[PDB]
Amino acid sequence: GRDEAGITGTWYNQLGSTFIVTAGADGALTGTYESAAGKAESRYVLTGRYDSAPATDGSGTALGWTVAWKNNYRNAHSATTWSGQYVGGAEARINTQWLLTSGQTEANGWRSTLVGHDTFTKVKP
Amino acid sequence: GRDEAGITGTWYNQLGSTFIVTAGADGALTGTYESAAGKAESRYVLTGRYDSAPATDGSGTALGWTVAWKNNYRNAHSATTWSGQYVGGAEARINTQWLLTSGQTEANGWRSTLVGHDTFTKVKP
Amino acid sequence: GRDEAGITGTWYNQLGSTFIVTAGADGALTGTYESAAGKAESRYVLTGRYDSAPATDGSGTALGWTVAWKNNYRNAHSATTWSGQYVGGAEARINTQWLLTSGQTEANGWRSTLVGHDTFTKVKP
Amino acid sequence: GRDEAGITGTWYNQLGSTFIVTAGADGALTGTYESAAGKAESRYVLTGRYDSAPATDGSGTALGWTVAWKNNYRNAHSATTWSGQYVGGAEARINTQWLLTSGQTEANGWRSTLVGHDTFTKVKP
Ligand SMILES: O=C(CCCC[C@@H]1SC[C@@H]2NC(=O)N[C@@H]21)NC1CCN(c2ccncc2)CC1
Ligand SMILES: O=C(CCCC[C@@H]1SC[C@@H]2NC(=O)N[C@@H]21)NC1CCN(c2ccncc2)CC1
Ligand SMILES: O=C(CCCC[C@@H]1SC[C@@H]2NC(=O)N[C@@H]21)NC1CCN(c2ccncc2)CC1
Ligand SMILES: O=C(CCCC[C@@H]1SC[C@@H]2NC(=O)N[C@@H]21)NC1CCN(c2ccncc2)CC1
Ligand SMILES: [Cl-]
Ligand SMILES: [Cl-]
Ligand SMILES: [Cl-]
Ligand SMILES: [Cl-]
């Protein structure tokens, strides 16, 4: 992986959530997520993928991951996906937008999905 | 997994893409994705998560997955995340919304992410 | 307006909501919206814009509109924007994706916005 | 309008775009938008709506607006909708997420819509 070394490690977003990830040489992301917001407690499993051979023209590295919000402490019957890109350097960042879907009945499916954006950095707010 | 049996298998969306997935007892999703649209050829790895203990009131099962659009044939420097829910029964479906992020420079990050929606069923269009 | 005649009139979405709109020669959209779903009763004002000189290569006509969910009967402290395109012909359609923002405190702004998609046609479901 | 006075005026986002708006007592937004990014030149008409009787518990004021990207200088065959909320006070802000739809053929409709987020303040970056 080109940014295997750059992506692997601990990241923090603007809410104070903590994203711990290992980028594998093949394109795998694995790790844990702890949200500072919402119906969440302690760490949750995450998994995702990244482009292991990004362009070399200054473009970011595309990636995504998923958390289902069930662990031994809580189940929020929901899942978030973050889609974004890693941008390396002295002020490295993972810039994302996310979709948070809740389990809903038929009648309520139209209101099942929240959208937002998180920016992750290597130092915490 | 409650819908481990229901989610595992082959799904098809409205574009004719094919989503092959195994749901693990823990909440894992693993499999392959073949897109009928866009800068894609053959199968790509996917990974994701689902709620393995959904509500029993008729609500769907929340889930999500990621594809990074790199394989041995093509690299589109991009990744899609699908966030949605599985709804079982005779007309089982996975209803999703997705975010497709491309690697972009600084100047172009504002235009890095497409949004859309896919509906997957067990029989093809 | 090129599709002034095509856009003007009554449209219905998959939820059974009714969208009544007048497209002005300049690019204006004005009208009323009645939602079959959610915290809504009777008609609400809408306003928006469309491309009054679309491409002639078979592409759709880009457009958007807003409803704030306050009228004399109800206030849901929220607003939806639909962004999409009109596609003319015998099976004319307005294909959209929408963002529904609620008024929220600081602590809750991350969960203020729902996302979805509506397809409008000239005949009702 | 409760925040008629607060919303009316000039706002600037993180890209340096300028949003000039008048909030009417009824819930109307009218004005002009000048984008610092993308296929845009000079000012474009906008129109939208806001909640003219927001909650009084510290929640923001929901609102939305549309720009179709046609004026006398340029036509980008596209339209953006911003959905968000006004938050008053010494550091007043309009926090938004947006959908930017381009006119596309049938074959390409799946890739017609960009998503992002803008934060507007009364002082420029
Ligand atoms: O709060 C969570 C789980 C934690 C999400 C944390 C989010 S992930 C994006 C953002 N970035 C973070 O770092 N943290 C936040 N899930 C909800 C979803 C909406 N829910 C319902 C309930 C009833 N009807 C509809 C919807 C209730 C449960
Ligand atoms: O086409 C793909 C990869 C395949 C995506 C297939 C998509 S996934 C959601 C939907 N459901 C499917 O089943 N299939 C489609 N990626 C693009 C993204 C945008 N790209 C750029 C290039 C230059 N600047 C900006 C953006 C070009 C590459
Ligand atoms: O239901 C409505 C107003 C009517 C929306 C109708 C929607 S527009 C897109 C779709 N297409 C239609 O044709 N119809 C639907 N608004 C909500 C939003 C979420 N709300 C809260 C409350 C508390 N906390 C958070 C959020 C409650 C009020
Ligand atoms: O660039 C613009 C018009 C100006 C948009 C400015 C955007 S509004 C949200 C953000 N906040 C701002 O303040 N400024 C930006 N429109 C594009 C859309 C994508 N386009 C295509 C072309 C071909 N195929 C697919 C898509 C090309 C034209
Ligand atoms: Cl609910
Ligand atoms: Cl580009
Ligand atoms: Cl609330
Ligand atoms: Cl194109």
Short note summarizing the structure:
The structure is a homotetramer of 125-residue chains. Chain A has one helix spanning 4-7, and strands at residues 9-13, 18-23, 28-34, 44-50, 61-70, 75-87, 93-102, 113-121. With 125 residues, chain A is mainly β.
Protein architecture, described:
The structure is a homotetramer of 125-residue chains. By secondary structure, chain A is mainly β. Chain A has one domain. Chain A has one helix spanning 4-7, and strands at 9-13, 18-23, 28-34, 44-50, 61-70, 75-87, 93-102, 113-121. The first copy, chain A, is globular. Chains in contact: A-B, A-C, A-D, B-C, B-D, C-D. Chain A binds chain D through residues 97, 115-117, and chain D through 97, 115-117. The site of one copy of the ligand O=C(CCCC[C@@H]1SC[C@@H]2NC(=O)N[C@@H]21)NC1CCN(c2ccncc2)CC1 has 17 residues of chain D, from strand 6, strand 7 and strand 8. The PDB classes it as biotin-binding protein. The entry lists the keywords artificial cofactor, streptavidin, catalyst, Biotin-binding protein. The assembly is tetrameric.
Task: Considering the chains and any ligands shown, give keywords for the structure.
mainly beta; Streptavidin (chains A, B, C, D); homotetramer; binds chloride ion; 125 residues; biotin (chains A, B, C, D); binds the ligand O=C(CCCC[C@@H]1SC[C@@H]2NC(=O)N[C@@H]21)NC1CCN(c2ccncc2)CC1; signal (chains A, B, C, D); globular; secreted (chains A, B, C, D); 1 helix; 3% helix
